[PDB]
Design an enzyme around this catalytic site. Structure first.
Site, mmCIF file in Angstrom:
data_model
loop_
_atom_site.group_PDB
_atom_site.id
_atom_site.type_symbol
_atom_site.label_atom_id
_atom_site.label_comp_id
_atom_site.label_asym_id
_atom_site.label_seq_id
_atom_site.Cartn_x
_atom_site.Cartn_y
_atom_site.Cartn_z
ATOM 1 N N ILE A 19 60.046 -60.062 55.856
ATOM 2 C CA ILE A 19 60.741 -61.342 55.733
ATOM 3 C C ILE A 19 62.219 -61.136 55.434
ATOM 4 O O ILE A 19 63.078 -61.839 55.977
ATOM 5 C CB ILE A 19 60.062 -62.217 54.661
ATOM 6 C CG1 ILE A 19 58.686 -62.684 55.140
ATOM 7 C CG2 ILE A 19 60.939 -63.396 54.287
ATOM 8 C CD1 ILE A 19 57.970 -63.570 54.147
ATOM 9 N N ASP A 38 68.126 -53.254 49.094
ATOM 10 C CA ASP A 38 66.711 -52.956 48.912
ATOM 11 C C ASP A 38 66.553 -51.962 47.771
ATOM 12 O O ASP A 38 67.518 -51.357 47.302
ATOM 13 C CB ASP A 38 66.062 -52.409 50.191
ATOM 14 C CG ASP A 38 64.536 -52.400 50.115
ATOM 15 O OD1 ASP A 38 63.986 -52.560 49.006
ATOM 16 O OD2 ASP A 38 63.881 -52.211 51.157
ATOM 17 N N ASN A 91 64.629 -62.627 48.055
ATOM 18 C CA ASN A 91 63.356 -62.261 48.653
ATOM 19 C C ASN A 91 62.693 -61.099 47.924
ATOM 20 O O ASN A 91 61.488 -60.886 48.089
ATOM 21 C CB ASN A 91 63.549 -61.902 50.134
ATOM 22 C CG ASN A 91 62.261 -61.465 50.801
ATOM 23 O OD1 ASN A 91 61.216 -62.093 50.625
ATOM 24 N ND2 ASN A 91 62.319 -60.368 51.541
ATOM 25 N N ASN A 147 48.384 -72.760 44.605
ATOM 26 C CA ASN A 147 46.935 -72.658 44.653
ATOM 27 C C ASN A 147 46.399 -71.924 43.428
ATOM 28 O O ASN A 147 47.124 -71.226 42.715
ATOM 29 C CB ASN A 147 46.490 -71.950 45.935
ATOM 30 C CG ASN A 147 47.202 -72.473 47.164
ATOM 31 O OD1 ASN A 147 47.524 -73.658 47.249
ATOM 32 N ND2 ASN A 147 47.447 -71.593 48.127
ATOM 33 N N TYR A 155 50.542 -63.004 39.087
ATOM 34 C CA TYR A 155 51.288 -63.397 40.282
ATOM 35 C C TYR A 155 51.463 -64.908 40.360
ATOM 36 O O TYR A 155 52.563 -65.404 40.637
ATOM 37 C CB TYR A 155 50.579 -62.877 41.535
ATOM 38 C CG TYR A 155 51.437 -62.874 42.784
ATOM 39 C CD1 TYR A 155 52.604 -62.128 42.851
ATOM 40 C CD2 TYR A 155 51.075 -63.622 43.897
ATOM 41 C CE1 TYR A 155 53.386 -62.128 43.990
ATOM 42 C CE2 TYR A 155 51.851 -63.627 45.041
ATOM 43 C CZ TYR A 155 53.005 -62.876 45.080
ATOM 44 O OH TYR A 155 53.787 -62.871 46.211
ATOM 45 N N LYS A 159 54.930 -67.093 40.314
ATOM 46 C CA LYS A 159 55.416 -67.823 41.481
ATOM 47 C C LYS A 159 55.591 -69.312 41.184
ATOM 48 O O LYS A 159 56.567 -69.930 41.633
ATOM 49 C CB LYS A 159 54.481 -67.590 42.666
ATOM 50 C CG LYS A 159 54.515 -66.151 43.170
ATOM 51 C CD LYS A 159 55.955 -65.652 43.249
ATOM 52 C CE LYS A 159 56.086 -64.404 44.109
ATOM 53 N NZ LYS A 159 57.491 -63.900 44.165
ATOM 54 N N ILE A 188 51.677 -63.856 56.737
ATOM 55 C CA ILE A 188 52.692 -63.532 57.779
ATOM 56 C C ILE A 188 52.293 -62.223 58.462
ATOM 57 O O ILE A 188 52.016 -61.271 57.764
ATOM 58 C CB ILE A 188 54.093 -63.430 57.155
ATOM 59 C CG1 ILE A 188 54.806 -64.779 57.127
ATOM 60 C CG2 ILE A 188 54.918 -62.386 57.875
ATOM 61 C CD1 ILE A 188 54.084 -65.828 56.342
#
Lengths: 239, 239
Positions: A19, A38, A91, A147, A155, A159, A188
């Protein structure tokens, strides 16, 4: 088409593969000078050289987003190379299914990685977006911040914290002319199990990193000039 | 009436004043043995002694929920005094409006206080609740986990993290017979008050006993099939 974001400088974290690499390439095609960073210097340099070959302006750096040394390094390098900061794509991030009964050393890692690094980065970049007339922050989240599932104690909380951080610091840096938005990617394509996961994706296919890149390019562009505090889920219509 | 807490042991953090003190009193009246804890030993001991005078079983402890020594101390003290753990009310927390350009240290303390503490407490308490045949955890969140406002960079992110932690670790400790729920309290009682009530359609502020009865419902056998839920006790608006 205010869909060019031409006159800008975009810092893309974790942008050597997937991504982030796609976001960097598409932003560069749109006319933005891209500071690819990175955790690995080699991948970022490769992506930046590829962008320059394509005809874009880019540099490649090593950044561990959790290391303030590296964060100030990226901010100063963007300012030296291009003079200003107008787009920040957080990202960089990770984490995954850790059991409920995990060390707390694993819970704080999830938040130092997925949340603390990007908040500090936005703190660092927001002043430079201010004499620049305004900027665009884009945090790349996940579908676990909405969710509820097993093994997602670290995690998912991180998020959802990213999501509400977006929604709230939309109010603090709005006066600075800065728009905070987030993208929630899902499944993805960087197989009966694959079609079983497609059975809940109504569009009948998996998404390409260009989908996220396109959504980001919209959110970071002048076309999204009056869009802030929004999480956009790119999921084909399901989970 | 399955709205009693007989044969129950409830640990209640930050329970010397306000919501926590009223929760401790209401839970003790319901037949639960209450381990009142606080950051200050004197207030917890006073509340526990008042509960014992009223006709209930209670002890009072000093606990900085951010201190794993204090956390294990509370767990062991509960198991010593009453032999089991069946209810964990994480009311302890804090923080508030901090600037966007706030120091990074400030931003981790609201996660360490408002999230990491209660997650480690639930980790410590889950095995004993499983052993005791199940129990209930109640995180006392805030309405900032849902609303978007200025200066709420750390408080809002931490509170939404608590909300989604509730929602998700409902899935891990479900098999243990444990229910995780959360209460978001509005403006509590302790012409801007008139703005408050311009918003609150019921035309009054909430008493700590309202949160106490909501908690009592969520930690009782009446709510035995309720988990992963955030109940907002705001009178019907936002303050």
């Amino acid at each position: 088409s205010p869909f060019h974001l031409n006159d800008a400088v975009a810092i893309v974290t974790g942008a050597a593969a997937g991504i982030g690499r796609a976001i960097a390439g598409t932003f560069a095609k749109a006319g933005a000078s891209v500071v690819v960073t990175d955790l690995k210097s080699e991948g970022a340099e490769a992506v930046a050289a590829a962008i320059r070959q394509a005809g874009g302006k880019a540099i490649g750096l090593e950044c561990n987003v959790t290391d303030e040394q590296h964060r100030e390094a990226v901010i100063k390098a963007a300012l030296d190379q291009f003079g200003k900061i107008t787009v920040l794509v957080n990202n960089a991030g990770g984490g995954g299914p850790k059991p409920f009964d995990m060390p707390m050393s694993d819970f704080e890692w999830a938040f130092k990685l997925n949340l603390f690094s990007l908040f500090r980065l936005s703190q660092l970049a927001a002043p430079h977006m201010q004499k620049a007339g305004g900027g665009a922050i884009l945090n790349i989240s996940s579908m676990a911040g909405e969710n509820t599932n097993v093994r997602m104690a670290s995690y998912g909380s991180s998020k959802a914290a990213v999501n509400h951080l977006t929604r709230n610091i939309a109010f603090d840096v709005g006066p600075m002319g800065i728009r905070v938005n987030a993208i929630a990617p899902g499944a993805i394509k960087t197989p009966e199990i694959e079609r079983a996961m497609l059975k809940h994706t109504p569009l009948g296919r998996l998404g390409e990193a260009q989908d996220i890149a396109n959504a980001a390019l919209f959110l970071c562009s002048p076309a999204a000039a009056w869009i802030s505090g929004q999480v956009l889920t790119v999921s084909g219509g399901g989970v």
